[PDB]
RNA sequence: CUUGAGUCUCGUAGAGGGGGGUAGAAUUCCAGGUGUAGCGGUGAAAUGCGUAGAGAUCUGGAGGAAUACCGGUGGCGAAGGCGGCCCCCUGGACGAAGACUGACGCUCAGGUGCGAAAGCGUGGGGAGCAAACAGGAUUAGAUACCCUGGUAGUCCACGCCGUAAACGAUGUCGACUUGGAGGUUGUGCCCUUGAGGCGUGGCUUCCGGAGCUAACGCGUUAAGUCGACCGCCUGGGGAGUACGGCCGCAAGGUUAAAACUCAAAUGAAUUGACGGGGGCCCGCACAAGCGGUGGAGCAUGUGGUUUAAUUCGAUGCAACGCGA
């Protein structure tokens, strides 16, 4: 067997527990947009590869056609409701 | 009929249908139920499901007699011997 | 004469046989209650049971069959074959020393006897089963298969049959020729503990040497090496048939051809083919995740419609944004 891919820690905070999250809410290779999505939701709110990955995917996967101003900020509400 | 909470369960475990009686220690039957004819008949009989449902039928046929411990003296081997035994024991009885 | 053969003396093991009773497990109905919607089964129902009390329970009976464990790589028997317990009668085998006889032997055509199962005949017996036969459905139709009953038979006595893949597909008797691994049953020496350690017989299972064999294999229980006598074979089919004889209660058996036809039939082994009795391993093949196509409008391609033509080829994966 082989281990899971090792990703460099999120440069902005130098922490590994945030890069994996921003890579899956990402769409179509648009990482640059991803920070515009989640950092606005994060910087302004103020085996380990099975259950954390699956549960956190469920959070991202319900923001496609909810029909409001912008799901960019709706997911901020969703995580605010979650938190 | 006697409310003794005792007796034996003569399991007439035949291949096609296992038709268990509830007789006392003396040797007189209390209440009866059957697997075949009692909700299903065919060549698809002789299954552990049939033995289990026969066990629950034989239980509910004598659940009103005030009996809570019935021994098992099985006559011959039948399909789903463990299924009927487990189903009968699940009814709250002592062998 | 005594080495073969036998007689004797003493023990051992054995489903060897014939009888005689003997007991339970299971077996069905009745004798009763306990019980009322079931019992029953296949490809599927159904046929047959039952609510008139049906199954099971315990209770006693009835009666027949057969003796689960032991149980076996076991045993005994000429073979067929023999399996609960116990008695009576009985047969054979083997071992230890000794005595006795004194070649009394081996094999045997003919002959005689025994001889599974089925069957037959005569009387019984019949608990289960089970050719036949009887219900249902079959299946392409069903007189399939099946299930439900079921009679002969199966069991006993006597008589007949006299046949089997009656097979180790290996006649009987004797002698000789390396080993290894067992089992069963005696017995000698020494452990005088029970086995024991070492012999030594008989039976028996399996490897394998030489040898033999076409090969497979056999291999001291030979299919080796020999000797005695017997039986048998002579291409396949016709055919173990016809005819005759003998035998049998018909039932059939035994002995046993020919015409005709074919150029094979056959044994053993080799390769590799279905081989619907297997495993193992690997792979975005599955598991996880990601993104999608099948909905629509156009682009192109493919089949189909018409037209003179809609040029031809490509047309599962390995044609269809292909030749172009």
Swiss-Prot record, chain A:
The keyword Nucleotide-binding does not apply. Part of the 30S ribosomal subunit. Contacts proteins S9 and S11. Cross-links to IF3 and the P and E site tRNAs. The gene is rpsG. The chain holds residues 6 to 128 of 179 of the full protein. The lineage of its organism: Bacteria, Pseudomonadati, Pseudomonadota, Gammaproteobacteria, Enterobacterales. It comes from Escherichia coli (strain K12). Keywords: Ribonucleoprotein, Ribosomal protein, RNA-binding, rRNA-binding, tRNA-binding. This is Small ribosomal subunit protein uS7. The strain K12 sequence is shown. Has been predicted to contact the N-terminal domain of IF-3 based on footprint studies; exactly how IF-3 interacts with the 30S subunit is controversial. Belongs to the universal ribosomal protein uS7 family. GO terms for molecular function: mRNA binding; rRNA binding; structural constituent of ribosome; tRNA binding. One of the primary rRNA binding proteins, it binds directly to 16S rRNA where it nucleates assembly of the head domain of the 30S subunit. Is located at the subunit interface close to the decoding center, where it has been shown to contact mRNA. Has been shown to contact tRNA in both the P and E sites; it probably blocks exit of the E site tRNA. Protein S7 is also a translational repressor protein; it regulates the expression of the str operon members to different degrees by binding to its mRNA. It comes from the Bacteria.
